[PDB]
Design a protein around this ligand. Structure first.
Ligand SMILES: Cc1cc2c(cc1C)N(C1SCCS1)c1c([nH]c(=O)[nH]c1=O)N2C[C@H](O)[C@H](O)[C@H](O)COP(=O)(O)OP(=O)(O)OC[C@H]1O[C@@H](n2cnc3c(N)ncnc32)[C@H](O)[C@@H]1O
Ligand SMILES: NC(=O)c1ccc[n+]([C@@H]2O[C@H](COP(=O)([O-])OP(=O)(O)OC[C@H]3O[C@@H](n4cnc5c(N)ncnc54)[C@H](O)[C@@H]3O)[C@@H](O)[C@H]2O)c1
Ligand SMILES: [Mg+2]
Length: 1217
């Protein structure tokens, strides 16, 4: 049995002094990075004046030959709107997908020009975001396909065949010549002859998406290999400086190119790069390694080092490497490379770029809660960094070959004068991108200009593959701070364009201050609360420190005991085993006797007044202190969660962050709301599941405590140790022992707590079937006030994702693999049913199966493990029985093969099952099992019906670029957490308030603003909780009441209409590149069980004011109280004799004395299907209390999280950059 964490994340090699200096700079504060860059970038006054003069001459030439774009002349010639221009280019793109030119021309003449375009040509507008950038210069994340369809019809009906022909020829000139150098390497080489004669050189990239499968990585390998042959044949001995070279993207060559998979990278990716480099060496051409995301930088250095020390590659100086000046590590990376060049004797070609992933890096750091960004946040800082790094490179031209890749004439001029008068080919060069640098560099290359060479980066590929690259270039070019956008902006003077960033930064008040409008990850929520902090598992210092803390955590004698108010109690003790290796004993749990569980509730009841008397702000202060303790203890908490619950390090980090966020969110919500009149319920039993053994455990308890209730905490039997540690932390934070008792044990302990006479409320997260048993036990109970015992029951899901033909396969596959198999599918939010539009199903399924087989399953104390075990042998057996049933029915089953080492634990391999119908599934299967169904586009609405028809309603995902499909699907789906163009396992506290409907939950949502109000006897008004909209059926009913003479009830009805928050529509603060929306809708059909006429009118007013329909108990005998209803109200009203036949309901309102309420509550608990949130009142309470029925629980919360960067970039962030 291997020692825990003994092999957690060893680095590829011992970190040299130079490597450690890189890692140290990873997230260095921006104010600390800039001063040394300003110093290194400083030049003499004479040089600065000379550089400004050169820059002005270049810009004057650039603006002096600036002709209008072809698209702009087309828009002008035919008086096209922007949407017409975009629609025309989409049409042209489709028409160019027809190979036979005469067949295309006949389709244009005979069919398209005659208006009938929808008939003959997957949406025509799938790529309209790209063409929108071309036409408008602005990126819209989704496509308004109805606006585009209208615009296309309008323009064809107005201008006919001529505009179509012009659009086709315009698109042809762009896709085949402007953005790409050629569709094949041979075509690109043909097109390169013209500028090579004018003094340019080339570097070709067979660019595309990163590999998601082995097969795709192999395809990119053979594409690169064939291109090296073609380039080397064409080079014909010109060498690495005067002749062409290739650029490669390491992520194209292996599907798991990451620090977490460093061993596979060195074992599998490195030999492939070596083989390509050997071929480049034989032809004597350049081979440049492109730079990608910040978390791949240092990993790529390990490949660079091995390759440069490999004697088989000696004699060749063509190996090249990109470094990104927007990165805080850039000068230290250059120090490392220059030293490696010296050690190896290889003159490394160093391509200095500013950086292509800026908006993505901002979003990633925010999502991950990291200390700071790995890139600068002011564009001028990147410019200073670039010039400072150029100075370092120009001092080392004997050992490296600097390649200054930029389109900025000011940057260029500064380096041109920095480099001085001595020049020879091979000393350094400039570089640019095909189709955007030639205007500038035709003023540079050649003895009649500056006589400095330029290498053109030449993308090669079909139009299909060119889209992702094209979006980035156009988004970049239209960016607020972009040199290209500013040189085209007539309100920007040449004086502004030639301003020296070094001197501008030097004179700022705080040199290197972060951008004012970009929040550090800790500050995402501003004054409301401090964001939890994560850990960077790409940082070697973090990994080394975490390795030690994790090992230390495994040496601790973790215990869980019954912690009663009076002290620990004795009980039956057993060991807690690691689910991934039962030989690894994690701790010991002493479980609670049923006698002591009953005793604990009595102790809580006796302690309830004292805890209630602690002022809410001081209760909140306890939660904030517990959050601080959990943050500081995160590494140790990670280690415990990893071994006790079978979680990977990434999942444990997220788990502890979520616990911290719950604590701080409920503390702040308390400070915003709770006062003396919001009395506690009393002892609350918190029963929690194994699968989020710290986060959900902490969230329920924290909310109950801060609302003023003493808590009986009953953790899942599988995961008591982290629970006991959470209670220990809460007690250390100031929660009295009498206010928080821990009762380890199985469901019998949970049941003993639920049944205890003094139990005043139950918070349950777990399976629907156990929730139903708790509901039944509570159905014969009332509070001392004669009201139902509140139950929050958050239960299972059958979560779907719908994918149409507009979605990007690689994005879908990544989000599907994550959503379905993260934590071995043991998230309530996990993706269970993937729904693929028929036309793209085969391609996505092939990619999905390929990506499945790249997952590493094993004991989770290794960074390289993606998917851990399932929690128990019983869970394993349940899951495997489901798989074998499906397989026995003839369904296609794909499974990863497991390693022999999994035999010591309980593992289920990630599994894909192809279903015929959604009805093949009957219940949640809580494991790593993805089901796949296919649908025809016209059946989308029926498919949404089928998804809703399971009765669940927890998480739901949609991948589409099309606004009509977003509006359709999101309006018809009935689930609590929606996710657009991203994974569906997001539950960020206060950002995606989490919780569903139907079989998935009662609500209110955890991590949302209605939660605390369920835990007090009188609910406060939550922050931002109001709506100016009034339900119109409510209004009709209030008028009907006035017509019947029920004047008091009509007034109460109008008041409910105003008090209702139905229609609340908020955007919640969160990370950039995401829109997080929170809305209040009707719940559905509410069961009304009235006793009196006035009671019925009040119940109906409450239900209608919150948008609901109703089924009224026919046994009430009150049918004559609703004569002559307006049709609008009658449509919402049904009469029910057999309640179980007329459901499912979404809540209930009951009127009666205590024995009537108890009887009705028992009948309601017996109804099939969802647990119903029941509110009850006496006739007298209805007369006395306008809030007898609380409208908070008659609406349904919906969270929607939209990935607005999904089209390829963040438009709003580029507009402030
Ligand atoms: C010419 C070339 C370029 C590249 C490659 C090869 C060649 C030959 N390869 C390639 S491999 C696949 C992609 S291309 C390559 C690239 N990129 C990459 O990462 N890896 C790679 O391998 N590029 C793209 C460059 O990094 C860069 O985006 C552009 O050249 C634009 O910069 P500029 O001309 O200096 O304009 P500029 O003066 O307007 O500056 C724009 C830049 O400033 C930065 N910026 C903008 N806003 C900022 C803010 N608020 N805070 C801080 N910084 C900000 C950001 O980097 C932005 O791109
Ligand atoms: N909606 C959400 O937010 C959410 C979140 C996480 C998990 N879940 C659901 O939780 C389930 C998996 O977690 P689990 O396996 O621990 O759930 P579970 O129902 O098996 O047990 C949950 C808790 O109930 C207790 N329990 C069992 N029987 C009981 C009884 N008769 N009376 C009182 N308590 C009893 C258990 O000891 C445990 O503490 C899944 O269905 C998952 O979807 C829902
Ligand atoms: Mg269970």
């Amino acid at each position: 049995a291997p020692a825990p964490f003994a092999d957690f994340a060893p680095p590829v090699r011992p970190q040299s002094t130079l490597r450690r200096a890189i890692t140290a700079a990873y997230r260095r504060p921006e104010t600390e990075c800039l001063p040394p860059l300003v110093e290194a970038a400083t030049q003499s006054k004479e040089i600065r004046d000379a550089a400004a003069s050169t820059a002005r001459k270049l810009i004057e030439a650039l603006r002096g030959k600036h002709s209008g774009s072809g698209v702009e002349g087309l828009v002008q010639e035919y008086s096209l709107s922007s949407q017409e221009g975009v629609a025309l280019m989409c049409l042209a793109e489709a028409l160019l997908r027809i190979p036979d030119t005469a067949t295309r021309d006949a389709l244009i003449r005979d069919k398209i020009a005659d208006g009938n375009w929808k008939s003959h040509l997957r949406s025509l507008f799938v790529n309209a975001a790209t063409w929108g950038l071309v036409v408008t210069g602005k990126l819209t994340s989704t496509v308004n396909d109805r606006s585009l369809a209208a615009a296309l019809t309008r323009l064809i009906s107005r201008c006919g065949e001529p505009v179509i022909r012009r659009g086709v020829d315009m698109a042809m000139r762009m896709m085949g010549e402007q953005f790409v150098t050629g569709e094949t390497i041979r075509e690109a080489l043909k097109r390169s002859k013209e500028l090579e004669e004018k003094g340019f050189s080339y570097s070709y990239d067979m660019l595309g998406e990163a590999a998601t499968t082995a097969a795709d990585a192999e395809r990119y390998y053979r594409d690169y290999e064939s291109a090296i042959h073609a380039i080397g044949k064409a080079s014909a001995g010109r060498g690495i400086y005067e002749g062409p070279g290739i650029s490669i993207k390491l992520s194209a060559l292996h599907p798991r190119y990451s620090r977490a998979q460093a061993a596979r990278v060195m074992g599998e990716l490195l030999p492939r790069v070596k083989a390509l480099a050997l071929l480049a060496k034989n032809y004597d051409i350049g081979l440049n390694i492109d730079a990608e995301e910040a978390d791949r930088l240092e990993l790529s250095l390990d490949l660079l080092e091995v390759l440069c020390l490999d004697g088989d590659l000696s004699g060749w100086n063509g190996m090249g490497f990109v470094v990104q000046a927007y990165g805080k590590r850039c000068p230290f990376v250059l120090d490392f490379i220059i030293d490696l060049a010296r050690r190896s004797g290889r003159r490394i070609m160093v391509r200095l770029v500013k950086g292509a992933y800026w908006d993505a890096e901002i979003k990633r750091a925010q999502l991950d809660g990291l200390a700071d960004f790995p890139v600068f946040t002011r564009k001028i800082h990147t410019d200073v960094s670039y010039i400072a790094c150029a100075a370092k490179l120009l001092a080392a031209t004997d050992v490296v070959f600097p390649q200054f890749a930029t389109h900025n004439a000011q940057t260029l001029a500064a380096i041109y004068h920095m480099a001085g008068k001595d020049f020879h080919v091979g000393k350094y060069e400039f570089q640019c991108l095909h189709g955007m640098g030639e205007p500038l560099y035709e003023e540079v290359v050649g003895r009649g200009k500056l006589d400095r060479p330029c290498r053109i980066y030449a993308p090669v590929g079909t139009h299909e593959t060119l889209l992702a690259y094209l979006v980035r270039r156009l988004l970049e070019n239209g960016a607020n701070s972009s040199f290209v956008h500013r040189i085209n902006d007539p309100k920007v003077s040449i004086d502004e364009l030639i301003a020296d960033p070094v001197e501008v930064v030097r004179a700022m008040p705080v040199v290197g201050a972060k951008h004012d409008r970009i929040a550090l990850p800790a500050e995402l929520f501003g004054d409301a609360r401090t964001n939890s902090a994560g850990l960077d598992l790409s940082n070697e210092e973090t990994l080394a420190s975490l390795t030690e803390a994790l090992r230390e955590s495994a040496a601790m004698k973790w215990t869980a005991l019954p912690q009663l108010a009076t002290g620990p109690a004795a009980g039956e003790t057993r060991t807690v085993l690691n689910p991934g290796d039962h030989r690894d004993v994690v701790g010991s749990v002493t479980e609670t006797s049923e006698e002591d569980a009953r005793r604990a509730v009595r102790l809580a009841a006796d302690a309830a007044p004292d805890w209630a008397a602690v002022p809410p702000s001081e209760r909140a202060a306890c939660l904030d202190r517990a959050a601080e303790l959990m943050q500081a203890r995160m590494p140790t908490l990670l280690g415990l969660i990893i071994r006790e619950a079978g979680k990977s390090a990434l999942n444990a980090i997220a788990e502890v962050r979520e616990a911290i966020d719950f604590l701080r969110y409920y503390a702040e919500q308390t400070r915003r709301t709770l006062g003396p009149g919001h009395g506690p319920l009393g002892p609350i039993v918190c029963i929690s599941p194994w699968n989020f053994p710290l986060a959900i455990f902490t969230g329920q308890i924290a909310a109950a405590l801060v609302a003023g209730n003493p808590v009986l905490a009953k953790p899942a039997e599988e995961t008591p140790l982290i629970a006991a540690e959470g209670v220990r932390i809460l007690r250390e934070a100031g929660i009295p022992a009498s206010a928080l008792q821990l009762l380890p044990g199985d469901g019998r302990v949970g049941a003993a707590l639920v049944a205890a006479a003094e139990t005043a409320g139950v918070m349950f997260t777990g399976s629907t079937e156990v929730a139903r048993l708790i509901q039944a036990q509570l159905a014969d109970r009332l509070s001392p006030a004669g009201r139902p015992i509140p139950l929050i029951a958050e239960t299972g899901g059958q979560n779907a994702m719908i994918v149409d033909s507009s979605a990007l396969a690689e994005q879908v596959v990544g989000d599907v693999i994550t959503s379905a198999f993260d934590s071995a599918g043991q998230r309530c939010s996990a993706l269970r049913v993937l729904c693929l539009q028929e036309d793209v199903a085969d391609r996505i399924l092939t990619m999905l199966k390929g990506a499945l087989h790249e997952l590493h399953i094993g004991r989770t104390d290794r960074l390289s493990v993606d998917v851990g075990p399932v929690i128990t042998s019983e869970a394993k057996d349940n899951i495997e029985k489901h798989i074998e049933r499906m397989r026995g029915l003839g369904r296609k089953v794909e499974q990863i093969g497991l390693a022999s080492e999994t035999g010591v634990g309980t593992f289920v391999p990630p599994t894909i099952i192809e279903l015929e119908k959604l009805s093949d599934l009957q219940r949640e299967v809580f494991g790593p099992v993805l089901h796949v169904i296919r649908y025809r586009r016209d059946d989308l609405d029926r498919l949404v019906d089928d998804v809703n028809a399971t009765g669940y309603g927890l998480t739901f995902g949609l991948h589409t670029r099309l606004d009509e499909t977003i509006a359709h699907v999101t309006s018809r789906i009935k689930a609590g957490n929606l996710y657009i163009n991203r994974n569906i396992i997001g539950a960020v506290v206060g950002v995606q308030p989490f919780g569903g409907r139907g079989l998935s939950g009662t609500g209110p949502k955890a991590g949302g603003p209605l939660y605390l109000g369920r835990l007090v006897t009188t609910a406060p008004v939550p922050p931002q909780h109001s709506s100016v909209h009034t339900d119109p059926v409510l209004l009709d009913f209030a008028k009907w009441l006035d017509g019947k003479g029920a004047r008091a009830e009509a007034e109460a009805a109008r008041n409910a209409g105003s008090s209702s928050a139905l229609g609340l529509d908020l955007e919640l603060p969160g990370p950039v590149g995401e829109r997080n929306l929170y809305t209040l809708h009707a719940r559905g059909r509410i069961l009304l069980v009235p006793a009196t006429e006035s009671g019925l009118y009040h119940q109906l007013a409450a239900a209608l004011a919150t948008g609901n329909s109703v089924a009224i108990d026919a046994a009430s005998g009150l049918q004559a109280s609703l004569k002559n209803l307006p049709q609008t109200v009658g449509l919402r009203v049904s009469w029910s004799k057999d309640w179980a036949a007329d459901g499912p309901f979404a809540g209930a309102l009951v009127e009666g004395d205590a024995e009537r309420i108890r009887a009705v509550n028992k009948a309601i608990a017996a109804l099939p299907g969802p647990l119903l949130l029941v509110q009850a009142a006496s006739s007298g309470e209805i007369a006395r209390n306008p809030d007898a029925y609380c409208l908070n629980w008659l609406v349904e919360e919906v969270s929607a999280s939209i990935n607005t960067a999904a089209a390829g970039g963040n438009a709003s962030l580029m507009a402030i950059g």
